[PDB]
Structure formats: structure tokens, C-alpha cells
Amino acid sequence: AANIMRVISIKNYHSDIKVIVQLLQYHNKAYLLNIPSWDWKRGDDAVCVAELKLGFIAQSCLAPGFSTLMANLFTMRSYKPTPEMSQWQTDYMRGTGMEMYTEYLSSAFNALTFPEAAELCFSKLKLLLLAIEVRESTLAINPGPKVKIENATQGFFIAESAEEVKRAFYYCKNCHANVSDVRQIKKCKC
Amino acid sequence: TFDDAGANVPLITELANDSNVQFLDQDDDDDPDTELYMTQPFACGTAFAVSVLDSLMSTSYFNDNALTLIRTLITGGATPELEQILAEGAGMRGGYCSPAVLANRDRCRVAQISLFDGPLAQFGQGGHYGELFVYALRHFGILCIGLYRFRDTNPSSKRYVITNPPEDFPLLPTDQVYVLTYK
Amino acid sequence: RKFDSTGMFHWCPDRPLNDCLQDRSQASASGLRNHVVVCLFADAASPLIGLRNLVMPLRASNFHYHELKPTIIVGNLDYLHREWKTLQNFPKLSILPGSPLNRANLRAVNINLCDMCVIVSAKDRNMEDPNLVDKEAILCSLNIKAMTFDDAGANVPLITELANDSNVQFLDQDDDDDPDTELYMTQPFACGTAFAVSVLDSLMSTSYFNDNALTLIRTLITGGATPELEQILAEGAGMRGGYCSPAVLANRDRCRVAQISLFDGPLAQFGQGGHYGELFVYALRHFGILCIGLYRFRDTNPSSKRYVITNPPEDFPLLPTDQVYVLTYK
């Protein structure tokens, strides 16, 4: 209730501020959805920790460890080995070294299907593409062969840094197509 | 214990205070200096705690679309239209549906699959994660995002989770794969 | 028809609350239009606010029964049971039990068709720092204002009681306000949307300076609660009523506060660019209608908000959109 007041006060003072609010309860959300200038299409949002918690653990009922898989993608964490770690710890921690990142696909991806774009990202760029922004416009996850990539598509990636996903922006189907030392990929002449 | 068991029951437990995770398990080999995300019960997917959600505030701000993606997966598809329909206070209005809306039943789903048998088991027999990845996407549209592997490969049923393995990462027929799928 | 024993109010023999209680289907089935909605916020144990003081004016006997505004109260049922003993004598009254925030209730109540929605709270007026105290009323106001309806929204007429005056800044948008403004200058108060108990404080001082002025305000705002009625209620028997003698029933010719439009009818000639004094002299002379102020759109050049002008000058201009506060005998 106190945090709703705030958002009321902030929006009353100026409607066009992007407001992000933490909610401890789900049932409270419906109140702030009724605020006259609350607009998620404008980027306003509510982080309902109760809704999120129960969603994360409910996915674990569908796929046992998924809450851990998914929680690690959404916090900044550096990979930092030390030699006393077992195999499974060094593996697990490499997994924790991931975050999810967002970047625009280069023009070289244009008119591929999402399947070929994912194959190309994984095989050549060493990037795990999993979703794309489709033109209103909307997110789509693992979309089927019918969906073509289009110019300036935003892609959603799992990677160790923002520095990694850049490769998807710079890739060139002439200038980089055989650059096996992937860290060498940069602004193309072609 | 049970008739024709015990620690083989799959559990997930929410914790209010993170450091209590040390009590949740035995054969643990832990140290209380470990932060939650490195602890064996969290790495096995048995623990969960609200503290791991805290960077949802910051990630919310740095890329709004990422916060929509996590919601579209973890909720199973609670779109803002549903949030509005619930905010009318009438309860969750439903019934039969038109084919035009019912088409959305082809959403992508999070699923888990085993390399022990079926067409992928050939990769579980000492192949690599990239071979599996390229094959499964190409033949089924199944997109692989990580592995779930026994901690005791040499013993317990605990398994740890490996987000996004390297292309040349080895496989066992005991491995299970986290995947995104349409069927 | 039947009245309180002093003639002053319309009246009904006693009712169990279950005669006036309705569910959403019953409320939606009822043809509620041009009615009054009371959004009541209460906990079951919270203090009795005396809603009689709300209903009783809206049942003055100098209204005819066919023009009595129907009334529906949306609120906590257990609270309303302990209020009910005071209300049960009043006709055309009903209850929908539940939260006022649950839009459904508001739609089942035809909130979009009411002549006035009242937002009122029995919650503890000191329970937190003042920024939280009115949150129930503020959220309810914004909620109703944000709705939409089939063949709307901010066109719903509202009045909201506030426990803390400075919360009025949250009550409205397109506001152009400054927090340095005192309540009486704020747009929501000047429009008649806000009200707060602080504006009653000078009733102490005015009480002392001219007792008769305090009787005048009571005779208008109560609709005619004379000290004979106060005594009859103080006997604790409940509000005794029935049929009346013509000798007491004559008091149904009281003067009433009314509001009238210059958009059409015999006065519209003055609304077409005349002056308030021309209207005043004409209306008194032909109808005994005495004019005390205007209600005018703020956005004459846009919103339905209208501001109030007490006692305009003789040469004050008029618009056909103006509405006039008047005192009348019919």
C-alpha cells in the first residue's frame, strides 16, 4: 500500500516517468494497474516477488532444476575458478558465469529462418540465441521455421558477457564467414 | 521409507533466510563462507530463496524485454490481457474458445529430456553438447539450453545444473537436457 | 405515503437488513439510474460514522416520492449490520456487500449512470503518517475514474471525503496545482470533488458570533432535522413515523436547494450572453426562485470539471453551459 502511494505521487507529479515498483504481494498489483497514467507499453512495470518466486519453483515441477538454471541467468556473476573446486563445481560455476543479453542481429542474418540463425550463432559465433523481437512488435521464443529473420531484429542470447553478443551485430557473411578465431570478429570491410 | 524411496523423493523448498540452506542437506562438504548460489542444495535445484530475485530490479531497468522474457517462461504465458481480466475482480473468466485465440496453444514450452534412450541417446554415448545441439534443433526444432548431471558419476541421486555448455563439452547417457520445444 | 412523525422526511416501517441486501446479479438486474452510490470503506469493528446523516437529507419530505434518488451502499456487511438500526426506516435504499474497489461491484451498481458517487471511510483517521491515511479513498477515486463502459470513465460524478487535507493533490490530474496552496484554493475542492472535515473548524467560531447562522446551515444541509426530531430520536425508540395530519404535513412546502441549467427552458435567454443580475431579477420575479451562485466549466475553450462561483456581481456574464444554484418551493 505504501509503495502504491508512492507510484501515485510520482505519476501525479509527472505521468511520463518510467516507474519500476517492487511488490511483496500479487493481489496488490491490480490496484496500480488502475492508475490513470500507468503504462507497461510505455515501460512501467511491477516486479512482483511473490508471482516470480512461485513461477520459478512451479517450472521446477515441470523440469526439476529449472529454477536454478533460470535464476542464475538473471544476476550478474563473474566466473572465478579456484583449484580446490571439484569437476561438478567448475562446471556448475561456468554455468553461473552466464547472463542473458540482448543485441541486434547483423544484416547477414536477414531472411534466414530462426533455426538457421540459432545454428549460425551457436556453431560460428559461440552464442546461444533463444528468442527474437518480431514486428506493433512482440517477443517470440524458439519460433518455428515459418518465421524469417528481418532487418534490425533484436535477438535474445545466453552468453558470458555483452562483449560476446556483439559478434552477432558485427558478423559478416563475406568478411567473417571463416574467422575460426572468433575473438577476431570486428567491423567488416564487406 | 516405503513398501514395494526416502531421499529419492524430489524436493524443492523455499527458504526465507538464505543461510539456513546449510541445514537442508547432508553428504554436503560445504563451508558457511559460501554464498547461496554456490551451495550444493541450490546448485542441485533443491533450495530456492527470494534473495536471488533481487537483481530483477536492476535487470528490469537495463533491459525491459529481458524481464518480459523471464515472465513469459516462468508464468507459462500470463499476458497483460489476463492481468487486466483479473483486475476486473470478476474472477478468471473462461469457457470454450474460438480457434483464432486457441491457436496460442502452440506456445513454446520448457521441457526436460533424457539421453538414456530415444533418438538422441547416440550423443549421450560419449558425444559432445554441440553435436547434440545442432542435431536436435535441426530435426525437431528443439533448442537446448543446459544439462542436468549426477554429482556422483563414480551413490546419490543428486544432479547439478550446467547452463550453456561449450560446443566440445562431453556427454553421458545419464545426462538430462533442459530444452525449449513446440510438442 | 408515510413520513417521520414530524412530517420532515419520507419514511418506511422497519426492515431486517436482508430485505435491502442485494448480490451482484440482483444489483445488475435492478434498473439503477440517476441514483446515489455510497462507497463505504470500513472494518467490521471500526466506529459508526452515522450514515443516517447522509441518507436523511436525500429523503427530505419536500421531494416527491417519484423524484427521490435511489441509494445503494457498497461496503463491509458486518459494519452495515451495526449501522442498519439507524437506516432501516428510509425508503428506496439498498446494500451490496463487498469492497468498493472490486470493479465488478461498481459495474453491477451501474456506477456510470449514477447522479453522484460518494467515497467515504470509517477507517482510523490517525493510523499512520498522513500520506497513507487516505490511500483507500484515493485508490477508489482513481479506480472509478479509470474505468470504461459499453454503449464514461472520468465523467462519473464523484465526491470524496479526505481525512488529511494535503492528500487532495493526489486526487486529480490535469491539475496545474502547487503544494503551497491551502485546501480551499485547490482545483478538486473548487470543483466540489474533494471535501475535508477541516473546513468545518470555523463552525465553532461562527457558532459563537451568530447562533442563527448555525441554525440556517443546519436547516439547509440536514434537509430540516428540527430539535423535535432530535428529541424523538433521543427517546431511543427509533425514528417514529406513519401517516400524518395535514397540519404537520403542510411543512412539506419547505424551501429546497436545487440546481438548474441555462441550456434550455425559460431562463436560457439569459444564458445566451446575458448577466447574472438580469437572470436573478427575472427568476425571482416569475418563479420565487432565488439564485445564490453559478457552476461553470473550467475548460470553456476538454474536461467536464466545473467550478463554483458564489454570489456573482450584477453585471457578471453568462453562458448557456452555466448551471445555477438556487433556492426553490417546487
Per-residue HEC secondary structure of chain A comes to CHHHHHHHHHHHHCCCCCCEEEECCCCCHHHHHCCCCCCHHHCCEEEEHHHHHHHHHHHHHHCCCHHHHHHHHCCCCCCCCCCCCCHHHHHHHHHHCCEEEEEECCHHHCCCEHHHHHHHHHHHHCCEEEEEEECCCEEEECCCCCCECCCCCEEEEEECCHHHHHHHHHCCCCCCCCCCCHHHCCCCCC
Name the CA dihedral angle for A6, A11, A17, A18, rounded to a multiple of 10 degrees.
60
Beta-bridged to residue B114, according to DSSP, are: B176
The Cα–Cα gap between C282 and C298 comes to: 26
The Cα–Cα gap between A87 and B160 comes to: 11
With H, G, I as helix, E, B as strand and everything else as coil, classify residue C320.
Answer: coil
Annotated binding residues of A for Ca(2+), written as ranges, equal 12, 77, 97, 99, 160
The Cα–Cα gap between B92 and A29 comes to: 15
Name the residue type at position B122.
Q
Name the residue type at position C282.
Y
Beta-bridged to residue C256, according to DSSP, are: C328
Phi, psi of A118 (to 5 degrees): -65, -45
Burial of B96 from C-beta contacts in 10 A (0-12 / 13-18 / 19+): exposed
Q: How far is A37 from chain C (nearest CA, A)?
A: 9
C-facing residues of A in 51-90 (CB < 8 A) are none
Closest CA to C72 of C51, C101, C96: C96
Residues 6+ apart with CB under 8 A from C281: none
* Eight-class DSSP state of C130: H
Which residue pairs from B4-13 have beta carbons closer than 8 angstroms and sit at least 24 positions apart in sequence?
B7/B156, B7/B157, B8/B157, B10/A64, B11/B46, B12/A57, B12/A60, B12/A61, B12/A64, B12/A67, B12/B45, B12/B46, B12/B47, B12/B48, B13/B46, B13/B47, B13/B48
Residues 6+ apart with CB under 8 A from A49: A22, A23, A24, B50, B53, B56
Burial of B182 from C-beta contacts in 10 A (0-12 / 13-18 / 19+): middle
* DSSP sequence for C39-53: EEE--TTSPP--THH
Q: Contact, B179 vs B136, CB < 8 A?
A: yes
The Cα–Cα gap between B128 and B138 comes to: 16
Q: Contact, C132 vs A5, CB < 8 A?
A: yes
Name the residue type at position B158.
K
List residues in chain B that are followed by a break over 2.5 Å (C to N).
Answer: 4, 154
Q: How many CB atoms lie within 10 A of CB A10?
A: 14
Taking CB atoms and an 8 Å limit, are B69 and A156 in contact across chains?
yes
Phi, psi of C242 (to 5 degrees): 160, -155
Chains with 3+ CB–CB pairs under 8 A to C are: A, B
The Cα–Cα gap between C269 and A132 comes to: 66
Closest CA to A32 of B106, C43, C167, B87: B87
The Cα–Cα gap between B105 and C16 comes to: 51
Phi, psi of A38 (to 5 degrees): -70, 125
The DSSP H or E segment spanning C194 is strand C194-196
Residues 6+ apart with CB under 8 A from C26: none
Strand B159-163: give its sheet, edge to edge: B109-114, B176-181, B143-150, B159-163
The Cα–Cα gap between B4 and C98 comes to: 53
Closest CA to C57 of C231, C241, C221: C221
The Cα–Cα gap between A161 and A166 comes to: 9
Strand C323-328: give its sheet, edge to edge: C256-261, C323-328, C290-297, C306-310
Taking CB atoms and an 8 Å limit, are C102 and B87 in contact across chains?
no
Q: How many CB atoms lie within 10 A of CB A182?
A: 13
Q: How far is CA A130 from CA A126, A142, B73, B123, C1, in A?
A: 13, 6, 12, 22, 75
* Eight-class DSSP state of C69: P
Q: How far is B21 from chain A (nearest CA, A)?
A: 14
Q: How far is A61 from chain C (nearest CA, A)?
A: 33
The experimental method is: cryo-EM
Taking CB atoms and an 8 Å limit, are B57 and A47 in contact across chains?
yes
Phi, psi of C9 (to 5 degrees): -135, 145
With H, G, I as helix, E, B as strand and everything else as coil, classify residue C88.
Answer: coil
Q: What Rg, from alpha-carbon coordinates, does chain B have? A: 20
Q: Contact, C251 vs C8, CB < 8 A?
A: yes
C139 has a chain A CB within 8 A of its CB: yes
* DSSP sequence for chain B: -----GGGS---EEESSGGGGGGS-SS----TTS-GGGSHHHHTTSEEEGGGGTTHHHHHHH-HHHHHHHHHHHTSS--HHHHHHHHTSS--------HHHHGGGG--EEEEEESSSSTTHHHHTT-BHHHHHHHHHHHH--EEEEEEEES-------EEEEES--TT-B--TT-EEEEEE--
Chains with 3+ CB–CB pairs under 8 A to B are: A, C
From the list C132, C146, C175, which residue is nearest A2 (CB)?
C132
Rounded to the nearest 5 degrees, what angle is found at the Cα of B167, between the Cα atoms of B162 and B172?
55
Phi, psi of A125 (to 5 degrees): -80, -15
Closest CA to C89 of C240, C208, C192: C240
Q: Contact, B176 vs B114, CB < 8 A?
A: yes
Closest CA to C268 of C316, C324, C315: C324
| Cell triple for C44 | 467490521
Phi, psi of C161 (to 5 degrees): -75, 135
Phi, psi of B15 (to 5 degrees): -110, 135
With H, G, I as helix, E, B as strand and everything else as coil, classify residue C299.
Answer: coil
Chain A residues touching C138 at Cβ < 8 A? 5, 8
Chain B residues touching A60 at Cβ < 8 A? 12, 45, 48
Q: Where are the alpha helices (DSSP H) in chain C?
A: 24-29, 52-55, 77-87, 103-108, 130-133, 135-146, 187-190, 203-209, 211-221, 227-234, 246-249, 268-271, 276-287
* Eight-class DSSP state of C276: H
The Cα–Cα gap between A118 and A142 comes to: 9
Q: How far is B97 from chain A (nearest CA, A)?
A: 22
A5 has a chain C CB within 8 A of its CB: yes
List residues in chain C that are followed by a break over 2.5 Å (C to N).
Answer: 151, 301
Burial of B99 from C-beta contacts in 10 A (0-12 / 13-18 / 19+): exposed
The Cα–Cα gap between C101 and C122 comes to: 15
The Cα–Cα gap between B172 and B155 comes to: 16
Annotated binding residues of B for Ca(2+), written as ranges, equal 22, 25, 28, 30
Q: Contact, A78 vs A104, CB < 8 A?
A: no
Q: What b/e sequence results for A80-110 when a residue is b if at least 16 CB atoms lie within 10 Å of its CB, and e otherwise?
A: eeeeeeeebbebbbbbbbbbbbbbbbbebbe
| Cell triple for C234 | 433521543
Tell me, rounded to whole angstroms, the distance of Cα A113 from its chain centroid: 20
Q: Contact, B171 vs B124, CB < 8 A?
A: yes
Residues 6+ apart with CB under 8 A from A75: A99, B37, B52, B54, B55, B59
Tell me, rounded to whole angstroms, the distance of Cα B157 from its chain centroid: 17
Annotated binding residues of B, written as ranges, equal 22, 25, 28, 30
A17 has a chain C CB within 8 A of its CB: no
Q: Contact, B53 vs A52, CB < 8 A?
A: yes
The Cα–Cα gap between C24 and C310 comes to: 41
Burial of C234 from C-beta contacts in 10 A (0-12 / 13-18 / 19+): exposed
The Cα–Cα gap between B89 and C58 comes to: 31
Tell me, rounded to whole angstroms, the distance of Cα C173 from its chain centroid: 23
| Cell triple for C222 | 440536514
Name the residue type at position C198.
S
The DSSP H or E segment spanning C290 is strand C290-297
Helix axes C135-146, A2-13, angle to 10 degrees: 60
